Amino acid sequence: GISRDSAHKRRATGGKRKSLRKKRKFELGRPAANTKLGSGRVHKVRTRGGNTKLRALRLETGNFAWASEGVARKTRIADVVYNASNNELVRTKTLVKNSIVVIDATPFRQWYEAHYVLPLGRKRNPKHAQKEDENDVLTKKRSEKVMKKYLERQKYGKVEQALEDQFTSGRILACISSRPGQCGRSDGYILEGKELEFYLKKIKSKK
Amino acid sequence: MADQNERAFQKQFGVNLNRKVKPGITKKKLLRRSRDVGLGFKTPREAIDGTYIDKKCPWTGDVRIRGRILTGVVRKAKMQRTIVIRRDYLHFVRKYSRFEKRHRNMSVHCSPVFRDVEHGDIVTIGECRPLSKTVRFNVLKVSKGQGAKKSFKKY
Amino acid sequence: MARGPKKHLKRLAAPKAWMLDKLGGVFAPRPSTGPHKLRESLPLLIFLRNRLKYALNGAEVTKIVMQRLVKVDGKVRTDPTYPAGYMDVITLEKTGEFFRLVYDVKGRFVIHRISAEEAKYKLCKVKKTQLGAKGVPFLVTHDGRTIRYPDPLIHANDSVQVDIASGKITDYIKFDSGNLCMITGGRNLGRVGTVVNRERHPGSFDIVHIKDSQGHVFATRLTNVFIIGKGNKPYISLPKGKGVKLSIAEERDKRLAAKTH
RNA sequence: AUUCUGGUUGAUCCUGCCAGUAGUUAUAUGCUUGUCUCAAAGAUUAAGCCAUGCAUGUCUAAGUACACACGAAUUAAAAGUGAAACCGCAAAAGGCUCAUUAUAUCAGUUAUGGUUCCUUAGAUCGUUACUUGGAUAACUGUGGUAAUUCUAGAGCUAAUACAUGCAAUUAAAACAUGAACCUUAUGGGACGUGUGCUUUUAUUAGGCUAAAACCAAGCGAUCGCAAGAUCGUUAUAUUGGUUGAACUCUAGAUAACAUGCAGAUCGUAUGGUCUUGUACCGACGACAGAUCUUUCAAAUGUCUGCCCUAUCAACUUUUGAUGGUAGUAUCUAGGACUACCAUGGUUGCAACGGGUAACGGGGAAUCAGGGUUCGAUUCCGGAGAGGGAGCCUGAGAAACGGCUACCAC
RNA sequence: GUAUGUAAGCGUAUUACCGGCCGGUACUAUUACUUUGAACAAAUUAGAGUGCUUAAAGCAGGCUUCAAAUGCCUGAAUAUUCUGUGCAUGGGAUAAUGAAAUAAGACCUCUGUUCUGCU
RNA sequence: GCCCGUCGCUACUACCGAUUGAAUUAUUUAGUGAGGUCUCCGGACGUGAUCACUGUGACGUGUUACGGUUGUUUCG
RNA sequence: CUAGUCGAUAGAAUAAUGUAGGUAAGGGAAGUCGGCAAAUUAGAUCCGUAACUUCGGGAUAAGGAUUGGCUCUGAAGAUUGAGAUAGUCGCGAUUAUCAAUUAACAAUCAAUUCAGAACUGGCACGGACUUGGGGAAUCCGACU
């Protein structure tokens, strides 16, 4: 294998410090995940003894947080549009850390209608004019405190219009925050404020 | 210096725009938790209201300054966010009880809050975590930086 | 953990405050990861065989600790090479032994007996004050003993007095320049009191300026102090004459005074 | 003992040496050689090859016994011994080596807020078979092979081995939310669930000078019939730390996420309980595991300090050179390494280059100091088991009295 | 009588405050140098003790005890090679460095004719 | 009186040398690959469920209790 | 393609030798006066370059790797820059300053050569054509 030490790499002015204790077991690193977006597989391996680090391969889904509240919802990752550095990881569609991935916009719609009674996004009327079962679970009037609690609530549904265009189309972007190669998950959060409006210039203008 | 020029996006990790629902309104006049070293060194005022990102910055990154603390002089500053400083000392021989002019050279990293450091300015130095293959220090304070003769004066 | 973990220790590399011999043997006892550190501890094979001199050889120790005679700090500690460091109470009831560990004027250890009531309590330092362990609060002592939920005014770098048969704290004293102290493991180690000054180094390792009762000033780093009481007010029975660190001629004065010739 | 002595020259004095005599744990060898107190070691050339020998397992009252080998059998006790055989941990310590290596190893002072960890312990488990499943060694028996150093088929049989999980494995409670409620407010939910521990981000508060004017609730209370506007004191702008601070730490909260886990163990010695209900109870553990602390640690950094040459004066980016930044791996820093980016680190203060019959060091021998020589070799530290290289298992080797390759013999 | 080698007063940050001349606290251009130090394995060297019969050792042993031994202890120190760099402190000679000449001479400060507010 | 140098004798040293020379050295540019770890896949045998095979225990013969050199689609 | 030619005696027939274009399992100069006919090399990019030099070479030295088709991203330009701001008429129509912009901005059109990467095939790759074998020496004559 190849170790992760300084066995290579001539010292600071050019010359070659040659050998000095050829090899050690602990000082090595293994071949990486290279996790394509797939159908959710996983593998177990020994680490430095006792610890069980879990890597990911051929992964499908994950749970992803929200910005202004920290609302973590699990949903199927659809696809990818962008990775941060290696375009030769973009084209093969490989799951890495904090790359620009589009996910779902589905479960955040139904989860939020307690606080965000106005449904996000605006679904098409004349084919979805029937409710299965939307309009009753929006308000219901409750004859009680919770609808009255939702009156001083829904004062925070002043969200960004760009995701409101994106929620009504049903494909939101997000940023997978955790490490795929340390715990075997795809855990993240939606980019909302400033890097959301930034990276579309990195995508739609380069489209 | 930066208008966030990067092929990815750069941001100080650990903060988020939380907009309406909040315990009170903790504006803090900027969403940037600027820490301090607290070892007697005053913080630079530009660090708190900075737009620079600099994950390896000792004030604003995932860094806590460790080790010892020293002073010295700087020679080269071409490389990015990184200057080339120089220290002086002596050596005690056995044959003569006499001394010499030898020196070492440690390359060091800069936050851009000490923008425009030149030859031969005077810069104190403090230690931190390894950055990349040589850099285990970080610049503390432009303390004097004054050559009253050749370097530090306009013309 | 790499090709080790150094499961031996030969002659001449043990700390020579053990009063360890040279001839014949080629090894130290090498204690096993107990409630104190390596160079600070003082095990049973060192004390009982060579200075208490009630066990003749090492195989003589293999009976007495396995016949359950010696118990230290209430626990029997049946392993013979238990490290048994500083400020610990050797609770040997036969024939009423009751020993502890106080460092000498000469920095070594002394065969010295305490009382049974002095065996009930003991004094102990702390290193940090911790929040996060069960449930919210915690406190870590110096000797591997733990305190959960202490009184909230005792901060770190203090010395508290506990009953070993219980899990409570019976007394604590402050970190003040009017207190009786003990130096543990320095050049000036083994002097009682009588500190008046400290200078906080701005990063790091503040040394403390500790004087004696006769005006001789001395110092060491902060890892050696053991605050052992108030102004001329100890909390233990003391060893011989009070850590005074006299001259060699004054040490030769006891060579001529308290001798028969 | 801050010590000289002979020789040039016909004869003189001089610089200059050379020779002499001193010790020398520094090895050999020559001769001699009564007693003794102690006692260096196939390092040097050759890290060359090797017949045989041997340097490694271990059992307690207590993990598992069906051993005729039997103690015992009117204690079927089997507790003896347990040879076995599954297990438990260890086998990475020491000891042998100086062959590679040069600001590297190391010396020292020094970080781990930039990480992990076998075990002692120290707090440390009220979150529907219950005290379940199946299956194997020994043990027999059939064998085999050209083979002493290996090994099949069959019959079996256990667990503190494995698989699975309940009678308190239990929820009340506490408690978030929907919910019996109903009301204007430091007012109010009956109940369904949710309630362990870690994995994972995200969010939140993360270490806080003093008065009002004023106004949204209009709170105790005030104007007032009251609404509701005024003002106003106390608990209340109540999380830790070196206390040098995002220590992103075990803490506190929100939000979900997967995957396990949550002692079906045991004997000494039995008891309180007799309702003999084998219901309820003794200390225990050599016991197992999780949480944290601790200890011994190890592996990279931090500074200063290394031997010789100008017939080495400029070096390093082939395919990383020096930094940017994201990311990967890795137990973690990180050009460690991929990709994108900048055009740099270094040097006459002997840099890069070669060379050494050079492992560093604690240290060793000689005099008046200053020393120059060396120090393979019991202490310490770093390394290798023919030449080299991968790697299992485990906490821990890149291990060689473990295995694998090739190569040598 | 004399001497001066002694401390205070006196040609002046002999610092600001609360204390009984006397404690605590506001609170200082640097180095190199040197001061006392701190930290920092022995072992060896030096070596303090010490009649292993002496030595080289070694840390043993010494002891009305003589007729019982209860018979306390001394011990196993101390610094140099535990050179150095760097980490405290004393000191202000030497050795340089260091302001105020395209302009700061200051304001102890009621201090703003700035504004950053900050709880 | 010392004493200078070719020259020839004789011995020895060392250097230059056509011979593109001769062994040996520690690296090293690229040219095929042992053998492993990871991994795409493969998936013997050996099962548990199961359509289903049949006895008795059962049910209304079949199914299962109990099981089979049980076969077969089923699904792991 | 555009223009123009079948004009070279003929239908037939698989003998030598000759005439020219070839491949031939082994070894590869033994062959012969002699390595002469004849074979390998040939393009381009990437290194990698020895002795002797008049310091312009020798230099294509030698010594090598690499080279399809198909599917893509990365780069090298040109014209209008874009153009706030306040109102008018009735969103139509109408009236203006210029920082940041803006590095392949925002509209628009653009040559062609690069710089990489996935995947795949006689396992042949400049596929035919264009087109070099090389190396120490001697002796000439300098050279074109």
**Residue found by looking up tokens 């084209």 in the block:** A91
Query: CA gyration radius for chain B?
Result: 19
Please, is C39 exposed, middle or buried when counting C-beta atoms within 10 Å of its C-beta (0-12, 13-18, 19+)?
Answer: exposed
Beta bridge partners of C160: C124, C172
Radius of gyration of chain A (CA): 23
Shortest distance, CA B121 to any CA of chain A (angstroms): 24
The CA-to-CA distance between both ends of chain C, in Å, stands at 59
Helix (H) / strand (E) containing B126? strand B125-127
HEC readout, chain C: CCCCCCCCCECCCCCHHHCCCCCCCCECCCCCCCCCCCCCCCCHHHHHHHHCCCCCCHHHHHHHCCCCCCEECCECCCCCCCCCCCCCCEECCCCCCCECCCCCCCCCCCCCECCHHHHHEEEEEEEECCECCCCCECEEECCCCEECCCCCCCCCCCEEEEECCCCCEEEEECCCCCCEEEECCCCCCCCECCCCEECCCCCCCCEEEEECCCCCEEEEEHHHEEEEEECCEECCCCCCCCCCCCCHHHHHHHHHHCCCC
- A181/F22 CA-to-C1' distance in Å: 59
Distance CA(C152)–CA(C148), nearest Å, equals: 11
d(C-alpha A103, C-alpha A81), whole Å: 10
Verify cis geometry, omega within 30 degrees of 0, for the bond prior to A133. yes
Bases along strand G below 7 A from a protein CB: 72-74, 100-101, 103, 105-106, 116-118
- Residues 157-196/C with CB within 7 Å of nucleic chain D are 157, 167
Tokens of C19: 């009063």
Beta-carbon contacts of residue C165 (< 8 Å; ≥ 6 apart): C74, C120
> Residue B21 and residue A85: Cβ atoms within 8 Å?
no
**What are the chain A neighbours of B133 within 8 Å (beta carbons)?**
9, 12
What is the largest distance, in Å, between two alpha-carbon atoms of chain B? 75
Closest by Cα among C215, C213, C179, C210 to C197: C210
Q: What is the CA radius of gyration of chain C?
A: 19
The answer to whether B40 faces chain C, any CB pair under 8 Å, is: yes
Q: What span, in angstroms and rounded, lies between the C-alpha atoms of C235 and C123?
A: 8
Vertex B61 angle, CA B55 and B64, to 5° = 135
Contacts of A157 (CB under 8 A, 6+ apart): A115, A116, A117, A118, A120
Q: State which amino acid sits at residue C232.
A: N
Whether the CB of A149 is less than 7 Å away from nucleic strand F comes out as no
B20–A193 C-beta distance less than 8 A: no
Bridge pairing between strands B137-139 and A100-102: unpaired
Other residues' Cβ atoms within 10 Å of the Cβ of residue B122: 18
Question: Rounded to whole angstroms, how far apart are CA atoms C192 and C179?
Answer: 10
Q: H or E stretch including A138? A: helix A134-138
Structure tokens at A96: 């890495």
Q: Is the peptide bond before C5 cis (omega within 30 degrees of 0)?
A: yes
A68 to B8: CB separation less than 8 angstroms, yes or no: no
Q: Rounded to whole angstroms, how far apart are CA atoms B135 and B94? A: 34
- Strand D positions closer than 7 A to protein CB: 92-95, 100-105, 110-114, 116-124, 178-183, 187, 189, 199-206, 239-259, 291-306, 315-317, 320-340, 342-347, 349-354, 370-372, 378-384, 388-399
Tokens encoding A5? 């030490």
Between residue 6 and residue 45 of chain A, the positions with Cβ below 7 Å from nucleic chain F are 30-31, 41, 43, 45
Longest dimension (CA), chain C: 67
How far B32 CA lies from chain C's nearest CA (Å)?
A: 27
Residue of A86, A115, A158, A198 best to disrupt the B interface, most CBs of B under 10 A: A198
A35 and A59 in contact (C-beta within 8 Å)? yes
Among candidate residues B83, B80, B109, B119, the one with its CA nearest the CA of residue B2: B80
The pair of structure tokens assigned to C53 is 């001199």
Q: Which helix (H) or strand (E) holds B70?
A: strand B66-70
> Which CA distances in Å does C58 have to C37, C45, C81?
22, 7, 10
- Chain B positions with Cβ closer than 8 Å to A: 4, 7-9, 11, 16-21, 133-134
Neighbours of B58 (CB within 10 A): 23
According to DSSP, residue A28 is labeled B
Element holding A182 (H helix, E strand): helix A180-183
Q: Which residue has the tokens 């000490």?
A: B114
Residue B72, min C-alpha distance to chain C (Å): 20
Residue C96 and residue C110 in contact, taking contact as beta carbons nearer than 8 Å = no
Asked if A62 contacts A185 with a C-beta cutoff of 8 angstroms, the reply is: yes
* Contact positions of strand F to protein Cβ (< 7 A): 36-40
Q: Cβ distance C85 to C145 under 8 Å?
A: no
Please check whether residue A190 is in contact with residue A72, taking contact to mean a CB–CB distance below 8 angstroms. no
Q: Which of C164, C142, C146, C108 is nearest to C227 (CA)?
A: C142
Q: Percent helix, strand and coil across chain B, each rounded to 5? A: 5, 15, 80
Torsion angle (degrees, nearest 10) of CA A87, A89, A94, A96:
-90
What is the nearest CA distance from B56 to chain A, expressed in angstroms?
18
A1, A28 Cβ separation under 8 angstroms: yes
Q: Under an 8 A CB cutoff, do A84 and B134 touch?
A: no
Tokens coding B55: 């994950």
Structure tokens at A181: 């190669």
